[PDB]
Amino acid sequence: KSCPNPGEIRNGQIDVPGGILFGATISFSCNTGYKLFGSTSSFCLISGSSVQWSDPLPECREIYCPAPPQIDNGIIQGERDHYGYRQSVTYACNKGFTMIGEHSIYCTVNNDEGEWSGPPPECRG
Numbered sequence: 001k002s003c004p005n006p007g008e009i010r011n012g013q014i015d016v017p018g019g020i021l022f023g024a025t026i027s028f029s030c031n032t033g034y035k036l037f038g039s040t041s042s043f044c045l046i047s048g049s050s051v052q053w054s055d056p057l058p059e060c061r062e063i064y065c066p067a068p069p070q071i072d073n074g075i076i077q078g079e080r081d082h083y084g085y086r087q088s089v090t091y092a093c094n095k096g097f098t099m100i101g102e103h104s105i106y107c108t109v110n111n112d113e114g115e116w117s118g119p120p121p122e123c124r125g
Contacts, residue, residue, distance in 0.1 A: 003044040003051050011060035012036070020044060022051045030060035033085030035112040037061050065107035065114035073097045074123040083107045083114070097123035 003020040012030040020026065027041045038058025045054050065083040068076060073094045083089065090104040101121030108115050 001051060003053055006042070006053075007057065009057060009060055011062070012058075022046055026053075028058050033063055033109060034060040035063050035109075063109050063112060063114045065116055068105065068116060069120045071120050071123060074099070074121070085109055091121050093121075093123035097125065100124050 001022045003022070003024070006014045006016060006020060006026050008014065009028060009030075011034045012028060015027040015029065016024075017027075018024040022044050025041055025043045028036055028039070030036050036058050037060070039055030040058065041055070042057075043054040044051050046052075062084055065087075068079070068083065068089045070076070071091060074091050074097065075094070077090045077092055079089070080087075084107060086106060088104050088106045091099070093099040099121050100123070102118060103121065105120060106117040108117055
């Protein structure tokens with residue numbers, strides 16, 4: 001009366017607190033910086049003389065932050081194409097300007113959405 005081996009999810013993990021017997025439920029998750037896409041959990045059902053999982057495995061996608069902001073009389077150093085969890089972009093004030101605010105912002109994940117740490121700094125006379 002046991003269900004089939006749950007398997008694995010690249011960039012995620014399958015939790016199995018109560019075994020995989022009929023009535024048990026397995027939960028799905030993703031490593032930090034990745035968001036689940038599909039069924040958030042499967043339930044061992046009965047059908048018909050041999051049990052089976054309710055929902056099929058989901059995918060773990062990598063959350064990305066929107067392009068970082070630009071500023072006046074300041075630039076970003078070595079801009080990349082994509083920005084994920086923990087990654088950081090650093091600002092520099094142009095010749096003659098002084099930097100107000102933070103030197104660098106980091107890509108964060110909030111509610112499975114890529115968001116920048118805070119607001120870019122400011123370059124002043």
